[model samples]
Target: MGTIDDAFRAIERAIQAENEGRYREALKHFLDGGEMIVTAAEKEASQKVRNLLLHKGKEVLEWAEHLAEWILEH
Candidate 1:
Protein backbone atom coordinates (compact mmCIF):
# COMPACT_ATOMS: atom_id res chain seq x y z
CA MET A 1 0.00 0.00 0.00
CA GLY A 2 0.97 3.58 -0.48
CA THR A 3 2.04 6.03 2.19
CA ILE A 4 -1.36 7.69 2.15
CA ASP A 5 -3.08 4.39 2.76
CA ASP A 6 -0.71 3.57 5.59
CA ALA A 7 -1.26 6.98 7.10
CA PHE A 8 -5.04 6.55 7.12
CA ARG A 9 -4.75 3.09 8.63
CA ALA A 10 -2.57 4.47 11.37
CA ILE A 11 -5.14 7.10 12.16
CA GLU A 12 -7.89 4.51 12.31
CA ARG A 13 -5.84 2.35 14.61
CA ALA A 14 -5.18 5.33 16.82
CA ILE A 15 -8.88 6.10 16.99
CA GLN A 16 -9.66 2.51 17.86
CA ALA A 17 -7.13 2.59 20.64
CA GLU A 18 -8.61 5.79 21.94
CA ASN A 19 -12.10 4.28 21.93
CA GLU A 20 -10.78 1.31 23.86
CA GLY A 21 -9.31 3.60 26.54
CA ARG A 22 -5.77 2.93 25.39
CA TYR A 23 -4.93 6.59 25.31
CA ARG A 24 -1.17 6.14 25.46
CA GLU A 25 -1.16 3.72 22.57
CA ALA A 26 -3.54 5.95 20.66
CA LEU A 27 -1.31 8.94 21.21
CA LYS A 28 1.66 7.10 19.79
CA HIS A 29 -0.21 5.95 16.74
CA PHE A 30 -1.63 9.40 16.10
CA LEU A 31 1.77 11.01 16.29
CA ASP A 32 3.29 8.34 14.08
CA GLY A 33 0.50 8.65 11.59
CA GLY A 34 0.87 12.42 11.50
CA GLU A 35 4.54 12.05 10.77
CA MET A 36 3.83 9.58 8.02
CA ILE A 37 1.37 11.97 6.46
CA VAL A 38 3.85 14.82 6.62
CA THR A 39 6.57 12.70 5.06
CA ALA A 40 4.23 11.56 2.34
CA ALA A 41 3.10 15.10 1.71
CA GLU A 42 6.67 16.26 1.37
CA LYS A 43 7.31 13.65 -1.30
CA GLU A 44 4.04 14.15 -3.09
CA ALA A 45 4.21 15.91 -6.40
CA SER A 46 0.71 17.23 -6.57
CA GLN A 47 -0.14 20.29 -4.55
CA LYS A 48 -3.67 19.09 -3.92
CA VAL A 49 -2.50 15.75 -2.54
CA ARG A 50 0.08 17.40 -0.36
CA ASN A 51 -2.48 19.78 1.03
CA LEU A 52 -4.90 17.01 1.86
CA LEU A 53 -2.28 14.91 3.60
CA LEU A 54 -0.93 17.88 5.52
CA HIS A 55 -4.41 18.86 6.63
CA LYS A 56 -5.25 15.38 7.83
CA GLY A 57 -1.87 15.06 9.54
CA LYS A 58 -2.40 18.31 11.36
CA GLU A 59 -5.85 17.20 12.48
CA VAL A 60 -4.53 13.92 13.85
CA LEU A 61 -1.64 15.67 15.56
CA GLU A 62 -4.07 18.01 17.26
CA TRP A 63 -6.15 15.08 18.46
CA ALA A 64 -3.05 13.37 19.76
CA GLU A 65 -2.03 16.49 21.66
CA HIS A 66 -5.48 16.69 23.17
CA LEU A 67 -5.16 13.11 24.31
CA ALA A 68 -1.81 13.91 25.88
CA GLU A 69 -3.37 16.76 27.79
CA TRP A 70 -6.18 14.51 28.95
CA ILE A 71 -3.68 11.99 30.20
CA LEU A 72 -1.90 14.63 32.17
CA GLU A 73 -5.15 15.81 33.73
CA HIS A 74 -6.26 12.36 34.70
Candidate 2:
Protein backbone atom coordinates (compact mmCIF):
# COMPACT_ATOMS: atom_id res chain seq x y z
CA MET A 1 0.00 0.00 0.00
CA GLY A 2 1.28 3.41 -0.95
CA THR A 3 0.92 6.72 0.88
CA ILE A 4 -1.20 9.69 -0.17
CA ASP A 5 2.01 11.29 -1.33
CA ASP A 6 2.34 8.47 -3.82
CA ALA A 7 -1.07 9.29 -5.21
CA PHE A 8 -0.29 12.99 -5.29
CA ARG A 9 2.95 12.39 -7.10
CA ALA A 10 1.22 10.17 -9.63
CA ILE A 11 -1.38 12.81 -10.37
CA GLU A 12 1.22 15.53 -10.64
CA ARG A 13 3.30 13.39 -12.95
CA ALA A 14 0.28 12.74 -15.15
CA ILE A 15 -0.56 16.44 -15.24
CA GLN A 16 3.00 17.28 -16.17
CA ALA A 17 2.97 14.71 -18.95
CA GLU A 18 -0.30 16.06 -20.23
CA ASN A 19 1.07 19.60 -20.21
CA GLU A 20 4.06 18.39 -22.17
CA GLY A 21 1.79 16.70 -24.75
CA ARG A 22 2.76 13.19 -23.71
CA TYR A 23 -0.76 11.81 -23.71
CA ARG A 24 0.16 8.14 -23.46
CA GLU A 25 2.59 8.75 -20.63
CA ALA A 26 0.05 10.89 -18.87
CA LEU A 27 -2.53 8.15 -19.19
CA LYS A 28 -0.11 5.68 -17.65
CA HIS A 29 0.43 7.85 -14.58
CA PHE A 30 -3.26 8.65 -14.30
CA LEU A 31 -4.05 4.97 -14.29
CA ASP A 32 -1.26 4.46 -11.80
CA GLY A 33 -2.96 6.96 -9.50
CA GLY A 34 -6.18 4.99 -9.62
CA GLU A 35 -4.40 1.70 -9.20
CA MET A 36 -2.47 2.99 -6.21
CA ILE A 37 -5.59 4.08 -4.42
CA VAL A 38 -7.29 0.80 -5.15
CA THR A 39 -4.22 -0.94 -3.79
CA ALA A 40 -4.43 1.15 -0.64
CA ALA A 41 -8.09 0.28 -0.30
CA GLU A 42 -7.29 -3.40 -0.63
CA LYS A 43 -4.70 -3.04 2.08
CA GLU A 44 -7.19 -1.18 4.30
CA ALA A 45 -4.70 1.58 4.85
CA SER A 46 -6.55 4.55 3.46
CA GLN A 47 -8.69 6.47 5.90
CA LYS A 48 -9.73 10.08 5.53
CA VAL A 49 -8.26 10.56 2.08
CA ARG A 50 -9.50 7.40 0.46
CA ASN A 51 -12.61 8.87 -1.05
CA LEU A 52 -10.79 11.93 -2.29
CA LEU A 53 -8.04 9.85 -3.87
CA LEU A 54 -10.55 7.51 -5.43
CA HIS A 55 -12.53 10.40 -6.87
CA LYS A 56 -9.51 12.20 -8.20
CA GLY A 57 -8.12 9.02 -9.68
CA LYS A 58 -11.45 8.29 -11.31
CA GLU A 59 -11.50 11.80 -12.74
CA VAL A 60 -8.03 11.36 -14.18
CA LEU A 61 -8.97 8.02 -15.70
CA GLU A 62 -12.07 9.57 -17.24
CA TRP A 63 -10.03 12.35 -18.75
CA ALA A 64 -7.43 9.93 -20.05
CA GLU A 65 -10.11 7.70 -21.52
CA HIS A 66 -11.74 10.66 -23.20
CA LEU A 67 -8.46 11.75 -24.69
CA ALA A 68 -7.69 8.26 -25.86
CA GLU A 69 -11.10 8.00 -27.47
CA TRP A 70 -10.60 11.32 -29.17
CA ILE A 71 -7.33 10.09 -30.58
CA LEU A 72 -8.99 6.94 -31.78
CA GLU A 73 -11.78 8.90 -33.39
CA HIS A 74 -9.36 11.16 -35.13
Candidate 3:
Protein backbone atom coordinates (compact mmCIF):
# COMPACT_ATOMS: atom_id res chain seq x y z
CA MET A 1 0.00 0.00 0.00
CA GLY A 2 2.52 2.56 1.11
CA THR A 3 5.03 1.30 -1.46
CA ILE A 4 2.61 2.19 -4.23
CA ASP A 5 1.87 5.58 -2.72
CA ASP A 6 5.52 6.34 -2.14
CA ALA A 7 6.95 4.92 -5.34
CA PHE A 8 8.26 8.08 -6.92
CA ARG A 9 8.71 9.66 -3.53
CA ALA A 10 11.77 7.43 -3.21
CA ILE A 11 13.01 8.82 -6.50
CA GLU A 12 12.58 12.33 -5.18
CA ARG A 13 14.52 11.41 -2.07
CA ALA A 14 17.39 10.17 -4.24
CA ILE A 15 17.21 13.34 -6.29
CA GLN A 16 17.55 15.35 -3.11
CA ALA A 17 20.77 13.52 -2.19
CA GLU A 18 22.06 12.64 -5.68
CA ASN A 19 24.25 15.63 -6.34
CA GLU A 20 27.56 16.38 -4.55
CA GLY A 21 28.57 12.69 -4.73
CA ARG A 22 26.13 11.62 -2.03
CA TYR A 23 25.78 8.14 -3.52
CA ARG A 24 25.27 6.10 -0.37
CA GLU A 25 21.75 7.01 0.62
CA ALA A 26 20.87 7.92 -2.95
CA LEU A 27 21.80 4.38 -3.96
CA LYS A 28 19.52 2.94 -1.30
CA HIS A 29 16.60 5.11 -2.38
CA PHE A 30 17.01 4.08 -6.00
CA LEU A 31 16.56 0.48 -4.90
CA ASP A 32 13.43 1.45 -2.98
CA GLY A 33 12.11 3.28 -6.02
CA GLY A 34 12.53 0.13 -8.08
CA GLU A 35 10.94 -2.02 -5.40
CA MET A 36 8.05 0.38 -4.99
CA ILE A 37 7.23 0.59 -8.70
CA VAL A 38 7.35 -3.10 -9.62
CA THR A 39 5.46 -4.24 -6.53
CA ALA A 40 2.87 -1.63 -7.28
CA ALA A 41 2.63 -3.01 -10.78
CA GLU A 42 2.48 -6.51 -9.40
CA LYS A 43 -0.62 -5.54 -7.41
CA GLU A 44 -2.24 -4.30 -10.61
CA ALA A 45 -3.63 -6.80 -13.10
CA SER A 46 -2.86 -4.85 -16.26
CA GLN A 47 -0.72 -6.58 -18.87
CA LYS A 48 0.94 -3.86 -20.90
CA VAL A 49 1.10 -1.55 -17.91
CA ARG A 50 2.70 -4.35 -15.96
CA ASN A 51 5.36 -4.63 -18.64
CA LEU A 52 5.74 -0.87 -18.60
CA LEU A 53 6.30 -0.76 -14.88
CA LEU A 54 8.67 -3.70 -15.08
CA HIS A 55 10.77 -1.88 -17.63
CA LYS A 56 10.73 1.28 -15.56
CA GLY A 57 11.53 -0.58 -12.39
CA LYS A 58 14.35 -2.47 -14.07
CA GLU A 59 15.78 0.82 -15.23
CA VAL A 60 15.76 2.07 -11.67
CA LEU A 61 17.51 -1.09 -10.57
CA GLU A 62 20.09 -0.58 -13.25
CA TRP A 63 20.75 2.93 -12.05
CA ALA A 64 21.16 1.71 -8.52
CA GLU A 65 23.49 -1.06 -9.59
CA HIS A 66 25.66 1.34 -11.52
CA LEU A 67 25.76 3.69 -8.57
CA ALA A 68 26.73 0.86 -6.27
CA GLU A 69 29.50 -0.27 -8.59
CA TRP A 70 30.74 3.28 -8.98
CA ILE A 71 30.86 3.71 -5.24
CA LEU A 72 32.72 0.46 -4.86
CA GLU A 73 35.24 1.47 -7.51
CA HIS A 74 36.40 4.33 -5.33
Candidate 4:
Protein backbone atom coordinates (compact mmCIF):
# COMPACT_ATOMS: atom_id res chain seq x y z
CA MET A 1 0.00 0.00 0.00
CA GLY A 2 0.96 3.60 -0.54
CA THR A 3 2.02 5.86 2.29
CA ILE A 4 -1.27 7.72 2.20
CA ASP A 5 -3.22 4.49 2.41
CA ASP A 6 -1.12 3.33 5.33
CA ALA A 7 -1.61 6.63 7.12
CA PHE A 8 -5.35 6.50 6.68
CA ARG A 9 -5.45 2.93 7.87
CA ALA A 10 -3.57 3.98 10.99
CA ILE A 11 -6.07 6.77 11.58
CA GLU A 12 -8.94 4.33 11.16
CA ARG A 13 -7.37 1.94 13.64
CA ALA A 14 -6.87 4.79 16.07
CA ILE A 15 -10.53 5.73 15.83
CA GLN A 16 -11.54 2.13 16.43
CA ALA A 17 -9.30 1.90 19.48
CA GLU A 18 -10.70 5.16 20.84
CA ASN A 19 -14.22 3.83 20.44
CA GLU A 20 -13.12 0.70 22.28
CA GLY A 21 -11.86 2.83 25.20
CA ARG A 22 -8.20 2.03 24.48
CA TYR A 23 -6.87 5.56 24.74
CA ARG A 24 -3.19 4.65 24.84
CA GLU A 25 -3.45 2.38 21.85
CA ALA A 26 -5.43 4.99 19.98
CA LEU A 27 -2.82 7.63 20.77
CA LYS A 28 -0.06 5.36 19.46
CA HIS A 29 -1.87 4.83 16.19
CA PHE A 30 -2.48 8.54 15.83
CA LEU A 31 1.18 9.22 16.35
CA ASP A 32 2.13 6.55 13.84
CA GLY A 33 -0.24 8.05 11.30
CA GLY A 34 1.19 11.49 11.89
CA GLU A 35 4.70 10.20 11.32
CA MET A 36 3.66 8.39 8.19
CA ILE A 37 2.02 11.55 6.90
CA VAL A 38 5.21 13.50 7.47
CA THR A 39 7.25 10.89 5.63
CA ALA A 40 4.78 10.83 2.79
CA ALA A 41 4.75 14.61 2.61
CA GLU A 42 8.49 14.65 2.26
CA LYS A 43 8.34 12.34 -0.74
CA GLU A 44 5.38 13.97 -2.49
CA ALA A 45 6.21 15.84 -5.67
CA SER A 46 3.17 18.09 -5.66
CA GLN A 47 3.31 21.04 -3.31
CA LYS A 48 -0.43 20.93 -2.76
CA VAL A 49 -0.38 17.29 -1.80
CA ARG A 50 2.56 17.86 0.52
CA ASN A 51 0.79 20.76 2.20
CA LEU A 52 -2.36 18.77 2.68
CA LEU A 53 -0.48 15.87 4.19
CA LEU A 54 1.41 18.20 6.50
CA HIS A 55 -1.83 19.75 7.66
CA LYS A 56 -3.38 16.38 8.32
CA GLY A 57 -0.24 15.24 10.14
CA LYS A 58 -0.41 18.27 12.41
CA GLU A 59 -4.03 17.59 13.22
CA VAL A 60 -3.33 13.93 13.96
CA LEU A 61 -0.37 14.77 16.20
CA GLU A 62 -2.37 17.39 18.07
CA TRP A 63 -5.21 14.98 18.65
CA ALA A 64 -2.81 12.37 19.99
CA GLU A 65 -1.21 14.89 22.33
CA HIS A 66 -4.54 16.03 23.64
CA LEU A 67 -5.64 12.45 24.24
CA ALA A 68 -2.42 11.74 26.09
CA GLU A 69 -2.95 14.75 28.32
CA TRP A 70 -6.53 13.75 29.02
CA ILE A 71 -5.43 10.24 29.94
CA LEU A 72 -2.77 11.57 32.27
CA GLU A 73 -5.14 14.01 33.95
CA HIS A 74 -7.68 11.33 34.55
Candidate 5:
Protein backbone atom coordinates (compact mmCIF):
# COMPACT_ATOMS: atom_id res chain seq x y z
CA MET A 1 0.00 0.00 0.00
CA GLY A 2 2.86 2.35 0.87
CA THR A 3 6.64 2.55 0.83
CA ILE A 4 6.63 1.58 4.49
CA ASP A 5 4.75 -1.59 3.67
CA ASP A 6 7.13 -2.36 0.83
CA ALA A 7 10.08 -1.76 3.10
CA PHE A 8 8.67 -4.14 5.72
CA ARG A 9 8.14 -6.82 3.13
CA ALA A 10 11.72 -6.47 1.97
CA ILE A 11 12.96 -6.77 5.51
CA GLU A 12 10.80 -9.83 5.99
CA ARG A 13 12.39 -11.36 2.92
CA ALA A 14 15.77 -10.60 4.39
CA ILE A 15 14.87 -12.54 7.53
CA GLN A 16 13.55 -15.48 5.57
CA ALA A 17 16.65 -15.55 3.41
CA GLU A 18 18.91 -15.26 6.39
CA ASN A 19 17.25 -18.27 7.98
CA GLU A 20 17.90 -20.28 4.81
CA GLY A 21 21.62 -19.38 4.85
CA ARG A 22 21.13 -17.23 1.79
CA TYR A 23 23.27 -14.28 2.82
CA ARG A 24 23.29 -12.73 -0.63
CA GLU A 25 19.52 -12.55 -0.78
CA ALA A 26 19.41 -10.98 2.64
CA LEU A 27 21.94 -8.31 1.69
CA LYS A 28 20.01 -6.94 -1.26
CA HIS A 29 16.73 -6.98 0.62
CA PHE A 30 18.30 -5.16 3.53
CA LEU A 31 19.77 -2.61 1.12
CA ASP A 32 16.47 -2.12 -0.67
CA GLY A 33 14.47 -1.80 2.52
CA GLY A 34 16.97 0.57 4.09
CA GLU A 35 16.92 2.87 1.08
CA MET A 36 13.14 2.86 0.98
CA ILE A 37 12.97 3.78 4.65
CA VAL A 38 15.50 6.56 4.11
CA THR A 39 13.51 7.83 1.14
CA ALA A 40 10.38 8.05 3.30
CA ALA A 41 12.30 9.68 6.10
CA GLU A 42 13.62 12.33 3.74
CA LYS A 43 10.08 13.52 3.13
CA GLU A 44 8.87 13.34 6.73
CA ALA A 45 7.56 16.66 8.08
CA SER A 46 8.49 16.08 11.72
CA GLN A 47 12.20 16.31 12.34
CA LYS A 48 12.26 13.98 15.34
CA VAL A 49 10.26 11.29 13.57
CA ARG A 50 12.55 11.66 10.59
CA ASN A 51 15.53 11.05 12.84
CA LEU A 52 13.99 7.84 14.22
CA LEU A 53 13.22 6.59 10.74
CA LEU A 54 16.72 7.46 9.59
CA HIS A 55 18.08 5.63 12.61
CA LYS A 56 16.18 2.50 11.65
CA GLY A 57 17.34 2.83 8.05
CA LYS A 58 20.90 3.27 9.25
CA GLU A 59 20.57 0.06 11.28
CA VAL A 60 19.22 -1.87 8.33
CA LEU A 61 22.05 -0.69 6.08
CA GLU A 62 24.55 -1.61 8.75
CA TRP A 63 23.02 -5.10 8.90
CA ALA A 64 23.71 -5.39 5.19
CA GLU A 65 27.29 -4.24 5.78
CA HIS A 66 27.83 -6.87 8.44
CA LEU A 67 26.17 -9.50 6.27
CA ALA A 68 28.66 -8.68 3.52
CA GLU A 69 31.47 -9.54 5.91
CA TRP A 70 29.84 -12.87 6.68
CA ILE A 71 29.65 -13.64 2.99
CA LEU A 72 33.30 -12.73 2.50
CA GLU A 73 34.32 -15.16 5.21
CA HIS A 74 32.40 -18.00 3.67
Candidate 6:
Protein backbone atom coordinates (compact mmCIF):
# COMPACT_ATOMS: atom_id res chain seq x y z
CA MET A 1 0.00 0.00 0.00
CA GLY A 2 0.99 3.61 -0.49
CA THR A 3 2.03 5.93 2.35
CA ILE A 4 -1.34 7.69 2.44
CA ASP A 5 -3.19 4.37 2.44
CA ASP A 6 -1.07 3.12 5.31
CA ALA A 7 -1.72 6.24 7.37
CA PHE A 8 -5.47 5.93 6.92
CA ARG A 9 -5.37 2.27 7.85
CA ALA A 10 -3.49 3.12 10.97
CA ILE A 11 -6.10 5.69 11.84
CA GLU A 12 -8.87 3.14 11.40
CA ARG A 13 -7.08 0.64 13.59
CA ALA A 14 -6.56 3.27 16.25
CA ILE A 15 -10.24 4.09 16.18
CA GLN A 16 -11.13 0.41 16.48
CA ALA A 17 -8.74 -0.06 19.39
CA GLU A 18 -10.26 2.92 21.14
CA ASN A 19 -13.78 1.62 20.59
CA GLU A 20 -12.68 -1.68 22.08
CA GLY A 21 -11.62 0.06 25.33
CA ARG A 22 -7.92 0.36 24.63
CA TYR A 23 -7.77 4.13 24.97
CA ARG A 24 -4.10 4.40 25.92
CA GLU A 25 -2.93 2.41 22.91
CA ALA A 26 -5.28 4.33 20.66
CA LEU A 27 -4.07 7.69 21.93
CA LYS A 28 -0.46 6.68 21.53
CA HIS A 29 -0.87 5.70 17.91
CA PHE A 30 -2.88 8.82 17.15
CA LEU A 31 -0.22 11.09 18.56
CA ASP A 32 2.78 9.25 17.16
CA GLY A 33 1.51 8.17 13.76
CA GLY A 34 -1.57 10.15 12.81
CA GLU A 35 0.17 13.46 13.41
CA MET A 36 2.57 12.71 10.58
CA ILE A 37 -0.30 12.50 8.15
CA VAL A 38 -1.79 15.70 9.50
CA THR A 39 1.51 17.52 9.06
CA ALA A 40 1.92 16.19 5.52
CA ALA A 41 -1.63 17.20 4.67
CA GLU A 42 -0.97 20.73 5.88
CA LYS A 43 1.97 21.00 3.52
CA GLU A 44 0.15 19.58 0.48
CA ALA A 45 -0.33 22.12 -2.29
CA SER A 46 -3.09 20.35 -4.17
CA GLN A 47 -6.36 21.88 -3.08
CA LYS A 48 -8.49 18.80 -3.67
CA VAL A 49 -6.22 16.38 -1.84
CA ARG A 50 -5.65 18.81 0.99
CA ASN A 51 -9.37 19.36 1.47
CA LEU A 52 -10.11 15.64 1.58
CA LEU A 53 -7.38 14.97 4.09
CA LEU A 54 -8.48 17.86 6.29
CA HIS A 55 -12.09 16.70 6.28
CA LYS A 56 -11.15 13.14 7.10
CA GLY A 57 -8.78 14.33 9.77
CA LYS A 58 -11.57 16.28 11.42
CA GLU A 59 -13.85 13.25 11.39
CA VAL A 60 -11.15 11.05 12.89
CA LEU A 61 -10.45 13.60 15.63
CA GLU A 62 -14.14 13.85 16.42
CA TRP A 63 -14.30 10.10 16.88
CA ALA A 64 -11.18 10.34 19.00
CA GLU A 65 -12.88 12.92 21.25
CA HIS A 66 -15.75 10.49 21.74
CA LEU A 67 -13.31 7.74 22.57
CA ALA A 68 -11.59 9.93 25.15
CA GLU A 69 -14.92 10.72 26.77
CA TRP A 70 -15.85 7.05 26.84
CA ILE A 71 -12.61 6.25 28.56
CA LEU A 72 -13.21 8.95 31.15
CA GLU A 73 -16.73 7.74 31.83
CA HIS A 74 -15.83 4.11 32.14
Q: TM-score for every candidate vs. truth?
A: 0.50, 0.44, 0.51, 0.50, 0.51, 0.48
Q: Write the per-residue lDDT of candidate 2 for residues 1-74, one digit (tens) a residue.
A: 55656644555444344343565554565465568667765566547777676676678667756655454355
- Please write out the lDDT profile of model 5 over residues 1-74, one tens digit for every residue: 66656655555544444344665655665476667768878777677778888887788678656645553454
Best by TM-score: 5
Regions of candidate 5 where Cα sits further than 4 Å from its true position: 1-22, 71-74
Model 1, CA-based lDDT = 0.64
Per-residue alpha-carbon lDDT of model 1 for 1-74, expressed as tens digits? 65646644555554444344565655665466567778888887768878988887788678657645554455
Which of the two, 4 or 5, has more TM-score? 5
User: What's the true lDDT of residue 11 in model 1?
Assistant: 52
Question: Global CA lDDT of candidate 2, please?
Answer: 0.59
lDDT of 4 by residue, 1-74 (tens): 55646645555544444343565655665466667778888887678789888887798678656645554455
Q: Which runs of model 3 end up more than 4 angstroms from their true locations?
A: 1-22, 67-74
64, model 5: CA deviation in Å? 3.8
Q: What's the TM for model 2?
A: 0.44
lDDT by residue (1-74, candidate 6, tens digit) is: 55645654665555454345565555655545556557878887777777777777767656765655564555
Clashes (candidate 6): 0
**What lDDT, from 0 to 1, does candidate 3 have?**
0.62
Q: Can you give the lDDT of residue 40 in candidate 2?
A: 63
In candidate 4 the C-alpha lDDT for residue 61 amounts to 78
